[PDB]
Symmetry: D2
């Protein structure tokens, strides 16, 4: 079990415990000042998603004609729900043009290269929607927190990421960056859900469990990054992710509003929820 300190109070969390203790279970949803008291009605979420998806088919037909290229980054804490936001957007997309980049950790050869090199290799050709599991922003989160990269390297990445993204925007590739937020209790509940589901247990490693008393360590790095890497060229979208249903819908609503695609049905997109989707610093 892990000794913690949740907003002033010292707490005891056993992940191998098949029982979720009261202060996680009852707190998880509202954690981190989540704006809503319960989950989105499911029927209503599913019928919204279908509509958003039918839109995303319009997008991809338009992408194939204009040759328009789109890139989509998803970052967040462990279990913030990057993958479910990714699978929501691509589930009913053509995997020929919409592809998910899942890069393993750098090889030796990749380590002596320009950090951005292996990301460049995955960049879109005419018409491609490229989505990122892990992005070049491991250098602004996991790597300096875990000391997988030097301070100087992290510091260079913060400096180089906007020059990198100016190049992308100047090329006319449309980059989205989504930071997905969850409250501390949610992470714990989700971590626990993974542990006790034989279908999701491979997602945990002892490291992820060791790095639970590194919340603030990660809070620090999050805030540095968003201020320092949110440019006009590369804006950051920040999502409240406690409810995955709301997180998915607003991710897709945001992208749809931002892309000037043929056959765009504004009634079907609806309103990006101001309570859920923000911009850069000042939102969290």
């Amino acid at each position: 079990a892990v000794e913690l300190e949740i907003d002033g109070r010292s707490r005891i969390f056993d992940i191998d415990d098949p029982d979720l203790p009261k202060w996680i279970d009852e707190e998880a949803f509202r954690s981190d000042d989540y704006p809503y008291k319960k989950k989105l009605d499911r029927e209503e979420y599913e019928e919204t998603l279908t509509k958003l998806q039918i839109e995303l088919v319009k997008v991809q037909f338009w992408m194939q004609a204009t040759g328009k290229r789109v890139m989509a980054v998803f970052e967040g804490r462990d279990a913030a729900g990057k993958g479910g936001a990714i699978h929501a957007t691509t589930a009913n997309m053509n995997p020929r043009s919409a592809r998910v980049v899942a890069l393993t950790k750098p090889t030796e050869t990749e380590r002596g290269q320009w950090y951005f090199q292996r990301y460049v290799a995955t960049f879109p050709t005419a018409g491609e929607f490229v989505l990122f599991d892990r992005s070049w922003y491991n250098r602004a989160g996991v790597e300096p927190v875990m000391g997988f990269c030097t301070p100087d390297q992290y510091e260079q990445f913060l400096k180089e990421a906007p020059r990198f993204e100016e190049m992308i925007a100047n090329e006319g590739i449309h980059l989205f960056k989504f930071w997905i937020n969850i409250g501390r209790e949610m992470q714990l509940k989700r971590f626990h859900d993974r542990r006790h589901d034989p279908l999701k247990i491979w997602k945990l490693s002892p490291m992820d469990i060791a790095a639970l008393s590194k919340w603030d360590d990660y809070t620090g790095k999050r805030d540095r990054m968003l201020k320092e890497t949110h440019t006009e060229h590369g804006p950051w979208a920040v999502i409240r992710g406690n409810d995955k249903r709301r997180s998915r819908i607003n991710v897709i609503r945001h992208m749809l509003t931002k892309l000037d695609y043929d056959g765009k049905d504004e009634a079907a997109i609806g309103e990006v929820d101001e309570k859920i989707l923000g911009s850069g610093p000042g939102f969290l």
Copy 2:
């Protein structure tokens, strides 16, 4: 419309199929499921399917762990007719697998450089490293079906492919990589029904191309190329598993059970695997 309407011979019987017409004619709609001597009258129960699938996927988590521990490498090839259900079979396999060790290879048309290479060069480029599970959406068997039928390869290149594929697969087997090859069959009416489902679902419409619709009359040619491919390339080192795929639930379940049965993985639970259904999964030519 009636604008893309086409005449078809459905088992020595003439018929017109209009894909843009949102009404599905009874000669398809009522005949789809049992078409081509399908051994069951109804679709596998939805909730039973999901229950069995979950058990099977837990076993796949055991396979993945065993593969990492041992460096073991697997390759799975999925072929069949258009809309046969190759992608759902793959997705059912990898839905709850680690994507950094189970990856899907989906290669696009050959570039100029590639056409001048050895046919297999660009597939070797995707081969597994240790612990990797590689699934092919379209494989090298593109030259055994789609390429000759449409004239994308010469008759000589086809003949040459049928000769070379066994040899290539022997290299794969001697290297210690486990290759599976799945042929997923559906009945003619079921293809049509699926084509129709696709046209009239705005989520699936993109699955249909012009090419797809014209190739509907080329059904008997595909049967020949199919039969000749199974005949020539079913070998000891590279067996064809042949799936009756009218019911996608029984198809996905039996694809996975077969793989689990042939893999000698750690923590294997035969009771959770269950029994491969011999009415659904058969072997090489003659099953079909």
Copy 3:
């Protein structure tokens, strides 16, 4: 039947490349064309001697690079027949081909064409220790591509604006980027073309395109100056070489590189001095 009509600095001549008689006005002017600073070609024995000392320092550079993990890219651009390849071979002849490699990319595929222009060049960037020389670089879009209409004037003007940003990131990373422009005089090009035509070890180096593009000399002069102007920056400076004499061209390319590399075991006496009459910086030299 392949004879071209040309205008050499306010004077009209015809050039038949397939006539083995090199006319006087080429033969007598090839060498000193374009205000070349020297009376004659550098003697062979002295060239070979000096090149040896230079390739020995290149061995020291390689060993330092393997040790410090240092990374170098060397870009070579010029008119046709300038001697880009000769200068690359002079550099790499006595270096380990497993840490010093040459990049010679062919025309872009359908896929590479729909991509970031710089994507396929980034694929070829060095890992630790590596020296990468470019046969044709991203500067084909600041040379052949707009002149020959292979890229749009919008794509050309986009490249001119984007290449210093590219080179900024290269420099920021600490990959040392060398760019050489190899200048030749007009009459020297004609001789070299004719040399290639009438020598069977060299005839494949020609195209009917290169011969057609002889009339395009002044247009190419235009794109040269434009490029050296826009894309000569602090993080990516252009070195300009007078290449009429291939021997002095090669020696100074290497001299420039050794001078700028702060490697262990370096011997200034062995490098000697860069010939300011052969090697200039940026525009305002030609």
Copy 4:
């Protein structure tokens, strides 16, 4: 004498000291004629350059011919350390268009590559239409350096001798023309060229501590050579074996064999000359 070493030069004990800039006469005077080299002296350099020039003009034809037919060629060069592989390659490629004649110089296997099929990283380098691909080191590092040095397992080395013929059958079935050259030198000759390398500042990087130590492992490598030529010399993959003591004669006859075997358009059989059977032989038993 800090890296000096004792050797059994044909049952006769001997001390070689590489870092001594003076070459002992038992090497210097014996190198050229080692391993019963059929000739007394070096091929005259001008005659060599004149011959090479003609061979290279024939190689321009090959290239034009390959581009028009799409014909593909691979050339593998193996031999002991310092046998002369890079030299045979550069004599081939010096006046060829590098846009279609490429030299493959593969570094050690990465970790990813080690868990792949042995041949996968080499298939990645295979020719497209009209390409001529030359290999500095090839897949035959599993037949030689790897077993001897323990970089691969006995099982992997055995695996390799079995698979290489199959691989080469696929290459031949595909219509790609594979040449395989083994370049032999005498023991004394190797030592001389090692010494040349050590004491030439242009060449010293070609020498490694590993290479010096493996000078005792001569007989070891002899065994691997003979066994590899035995198991992998087949009809679809013949080994051409070159006596390479003279680098000029080796380069010339490597090139003549290739010319001789390619039925290229413009072929001037008189310009090719005759392959010297004292220098080039085939498969096992030649040496």
